């Protein structure tokens, strides 16, 4: 019986797991002594691995390639050679006829690893000849990287996860660690335990807030109002870092101006927070010898997102909370490998190792190495513009890999039509997901326990994950399917194992070079940049120590005027719908929902956190199927009356296939990074009278979709 070390494929906490294999099967999971977790895991890492075994509780795992030769339906299995020639032929045709930009590809932030994300960009850029590569960063912390790129020159977690434990103040802002990154929550709690203070800036009363010295329940969509007022205080009371500011920043004056306007008192109503609280919070944050900002989607997913990020970073600049351990700016990245996909270049504007295509010196390099003449220099099409490109016929095929847009994108109807507007849609997944079912050609790959590679934790930390099991079917790794189509497309590519990819990679990215496999090892956590192979170079813990990576070394101060979300509330729909997630289930729920213990604590249709006080006045009671309509749709869910959600707004998640919250979200793509404002959706929650009839609706509807996918998978 053996133990094969791996890294959890759920959140970006990057918990090392020991998968105990017995005979030729995974028998049980158990926390390894990784850097971030140290013997601990949450319910998912512990219970969420039996999805490898094709439970079929939700969707049967993909066993064979498929092709839908006619658009009038019928996805019938076909052999590898047949699907692989079909793709290489089609993509070839679409490329000559309409140019390389006519094709869009996507990386993957889940079980593939950094290795395949790298290969995919390489394919798009060296074989198709397009910079059209993008991953979920688009929909998640895109804002985070832009604002943080301009302000501080780096969009990654400024400091380390393992570094939280010694801050003197955890400024948690619009982010729920207890539900999103449990091991990160346990680092924050640790900090509190070690005497750090804690501030939670969330409308809702998240578990986190219960342990916090201060809960600033700001009104849904008022971040800049509160943010400016804190700066107003940090400057008014001369609480800022004069020397840090003056010597390591740019833009203090112009920033100083705006905040002067925003005074605690002029905020009261917008923030819904008392000028005092605002002062006490600014006084507090500013007063901690070392205070660190952890933030998430309660920031990024508001179109004023790039601004709020840039704004928080300002407080940190203003307080010298950067360039030192246990401080900094920390957008805790979401998916297990979302950080890594960017690190590999599954972005339409950078090569792996964060070497943008605009730079010709980089192109000279990559093209030489890939044995190519020229590598595209203009930015690719961001995946979030696909339906716009698609309708416009600017894009004609999409090679969707390791993603589920048809369930996770905003305004799902749009995605649907996008698929119906594209010439060829290629889904390369591991489960017959809602998206894979609308595919033109499906290509199955190896699940997380069936292959290996590297993943990047939320804080730039590289970690190795090893193969524990053989696939039970003819499945190629994601990098073998791509390599093989490249080759059929005339560009010769074949890799013996993931490390070969990792070393080519290392030779092309000066910051990832010292991160050798030997170095990462079984329990090593190597946060880049790791320059030399020398074991003395164990990696970069916190960033911006000497300079700021900005073109002129200084951090760039910034803010703007508060601005409300798009969807305007009407007297008829006074309720604010703010999407979020739940513990126990993870994102598209294909893995998680197909796990026996997890499926058992939550199935269809999902919950809506409705506020106590106002639910009583709504005729809605705990556990009743209710409705929520929207300009984008009308979803049914199970209510859950409680005193946690903020009276006025409700909260729903995007993990359920039936009560699909996303079904009603308008994509108010941030002008900048093109990001959806999933945290603000104007909704109407009308109670359901005949529950018995509703309980059958949920059932019937669910059963319909599950049989739907099931047939298609096993047909
Ligand atoms: N259990 C589990 N964990 C996950 C996931 C999952 O599916 N399941 N998904 C993972 C992924 S992909 C991601 S990106 C992370 C995201 O994890 P988080 O960053 O925690 O994101 P959310 O939970 O979507 O929302 C964060 C908080 O912002 C708050 N918020 C809403 N509006 C505002 C506002 O106007 N101001 C402020 N300050 N806050 C506001 C919301 O109330 C919510 O509590 O979760 C990851 N971890
Ligand atoms: N309402 C609302 N919507 C949201 C959000 C929100 O907060 N509110 N959050 C948004 C955010 S932050 C994110 S990250 C998106 C999530 O973006 P999604 O695309 O939903 O991410 P997942 O849900 O992980 O989907 C991953 C897919 O990868 C497949 N897969 C797993 N391992 C492999 C592999 O190794 N190879 C291949 N070929 N496929 C594999 C899985 O079976 C699944 O089909 O959701 C977003 N949608
Ligand atoms: S879901 Fe996260 S906190 Fe949980 S075990 Fe996985 S990596 Fe760790
Ligand atoms: O961008 N984080 O999922
Ligand atoms: Mo995310």
Curated annotation (Swiss-Prot):
<dbReference type="Pfam" id="PF00384">
    <property type="entry name" value="Molybdopterin"/>
</dbReference>
<dbReference type="InterPro" id="IPR041924">
    <property type="entry name" value="Formate_Dh-H_N"/>
</dbReference>
<feature type="binding site">
    <location>
        <position position="428"/>
    </location>
    <ligand>
        <name>Mo-bis(molybdopterin guanine dinucleotide)</name>
    </ligand>
</feature>
<feature type="site" description="Important for catalytic activity">
    <location>
        <position position="141"/>
    </location>
</feature>
<feature type="binding site">
    <location>
        <position position="204"/>
    </location>
    <ligand>
        <name>Mo-bis(molybdopterin guanine dinucleotide)</name>
    </ligand>
</feature>
<dbReference type="GO" id="GO:0046872">
    <property type="term" value="F:metal ion binding"/>
</dbReference>
<feature type="binding site">
    <location>
        <position position="678"/>
    </location>
    <ligand>
        <name>Mo-bis(molybdopterin guanine dinucleotide)</name>
    </ligand>
</feature>
<dbReference type="GO" id="GO:0043546">
    <property type="term" value="F:molybdopterin cofactor binding"/>
</dbReference>
<keyword id="KW-0520">NAD</keyword>
<feature type="binding site">
    <location>
        <position position="179"/>
    </location>
    <ligand>
        <name>Mo-bis(molybdopterin guanine dinucleotide)</name>
    </ligand>
</feature>
<feature type="binding site">
    <location>
        <position position="478"/>
    </location>
    <ligand>
        <name>Mo-bis(molybdopterin guanine dinucleotide)</name>
    </ligand>
</feature>
<keyword id="KW-0408">Iron</keyword>
<dbReference type="InterPro" id="IPR009010">
    <property type="entry name" value="Asp_de-COase-like_dom_sf"/>
</dbReference>
<feature type="binding site">
    <location>
        <position position="15"/>
    </location>
    <ligand>
        <name>[4Fe-4S] cluster</name>
    </ligand>
</feature>
<keyword id="KW-0560">Oxidoreductase</keyword>
<keyword id="KW-0411">Iron-sulfur</keyword>
<feature type="binding site">
    <location>
        <position position="8"/>
    </location>
    <ligand>
        <name>[4Fe-4S] cluster</name>
    </ligand>
</feature>
<feature type="binding site">
    <location>
        <position position="404"/>
    </location>
    <ligand>
        <name>Mo-bis(molybdopterin guanine dinucleotide)</name>
    </ligand>
</feature>
<feature type="active site" description="Electron donor/acceptor">
    <location>
        <position position="44"/>
    </location>
</feature>
<feature type="binding site">
    <location>
        <position position="42"/>
    </location>
    <ligand>
        <name>[4Fe-4S] cluster</name>
    </ligand>
</feature>
<comment type="similarity">
    <text>Belongs to the prokaryotic molybdopterin-containing oxidoreductase family.</text>
</comment>
<feature type="binding site">
    <location>
        <position position="110"/>
    </location>
    <ligand>
        <name>Mo-bis(molybdopterin guanine dinucleotide)</name>
    </ligand>
</feature>
<keyword id="KW-0479">Metal-binding</keyword>
<feature type="binding site">
    <location>
        <position position="408"/>
    </location>
    <ligand>
        <name>Mo-bis(molybdopterin guanine dinucleotide)</name>
    </ligand>
</feature>
<dbReference type="GO" id="GO:0022904">
    <property type="term" value="P:respiratory electron transport chain"/>
</dbReference>
<feature type="binding site">
    <location>
        <position position="679"/>
    </location>
    <ligand>
        <name>Mo-bis(molybdopterin guanine dinucleotide)</name>
    </ligand>
</feature>
<feature type="binding site">
    <location>
        <position position="223"/>
    </location>
    <ligand>
        <name>Mo-bis(molybdopterin guanine dinucleotide)</name>
    </ligand>
</feature>
<dbReference type="GO" id="GO:0015944">
    <property type="term" value="P:formate oxidation"/>
</dbReference>
<dbReference type="GO" id="GO:0016903">
    <property type="term" value="F:oxidoreductase activity, acting on the aldehyde or oxo group of donors"/>
</dbReference>
<feature type="binding site">
    <location>
        <position position="180"/>
    </location>
    <ligand>
        <name>Mo-bis(molybdopterin guanine dinucleotide)</name>
    </ligand>
</feature>
<feature type="binding site">
    <location>
        <position position="335"/>
    </location>
    <ligand>
        <name>Mo-bis(molybdopterin guanine dinucleotide)</name>
    </ligand>
</feature>
<feature type="binding site">
    <location>
        <position position="201"/>
    </location>
    <ligand>
        <name>Mo-bis(molybdopterin guanine dinucleotide)</name>
    </ligand>
</feature>
<comment type="function">
    <text>Decomposes formic acid to hydrogen and carbon dioxide under anaerobic conditions in the absence of exogenous electron acceptors.</text>
</comment>
<dbReference type="GO" id="GO:0051539">
    <property type="term" value="F:4 iron, 4 sulfur cluster binding"/>
</dbReference>
<feature type="binding site">
    <location>
        <position position="429"/>
    </location>
    <ligand>
        <name>Mo-bis(molybdopterin guanine dinucleotide)</name>
    </ligand>
</feature>
<keyword id="KW-0500">Molybdenum</keyword>
<keyword id="KW-0712">Selenocysteine</keyword>
<dbReference type="InterPro" id="IPR006656">
    <property type="entry name" value="Mopterin_OxRdtase"/>
</dbReference>
<dbReference type="GO" id="GO:0019628">
    <property type="term" value="P:urate catabolic process"/>
</dbReference>
<feature type="binding site">
    <location>
        <position position="445"/>
    </location>
    <ligand>
        <name>Mo-bis(molybdopterin guanine dinucleotide)</name>
    </ligand>
</feature>
<comment type="subunit">
    <text>Consists of two separable enzymatic activities: a formate dehydrogenase component (FDH-H) and hydrogenase-3.</text>
</comment>
<protein>
    <recommendedName>
        <fullName>Formate dehydrogenase H</fullName>
        <ecNumber>1.17.98.4</ecNumber>
    </recommendedName>
</protein>
